[PDB]
Amino acid sequence: DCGHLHDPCPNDRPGHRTCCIGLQCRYGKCLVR
């Protein structure tokens, strides 16, 4: 279970992020790692 590239990540935690592969959670939002 993963989110989109520009999708939100409020439940972002170490070891279980809401971002898919090749993504990163920053600024309360997800972006391209």
- Lookup: tokens for 14: 């170490």
- Lookup: tokens for 33: 């790692």
Dihedral of alpha carbons 16, 13, 33, 1, sign: positive
8 and 2 Cβ atoms separated by less than 8 Å: no
Experimental determination technique: NMR
CA–CA distance, 24 with 12 (Å, rounded to integer)? 10
| Alpha-helical regions (H) of the chain | none
Location of structure tokens 């790692």: 33
For residue 23, give every residue at least 6 positions away whose Cβ sits within 8 Å of its Cβ, in sequence order, or none: 2, 3, 5, 17, 30, 31, 32, 33
Q: Which amino acid is at 14?
A: P
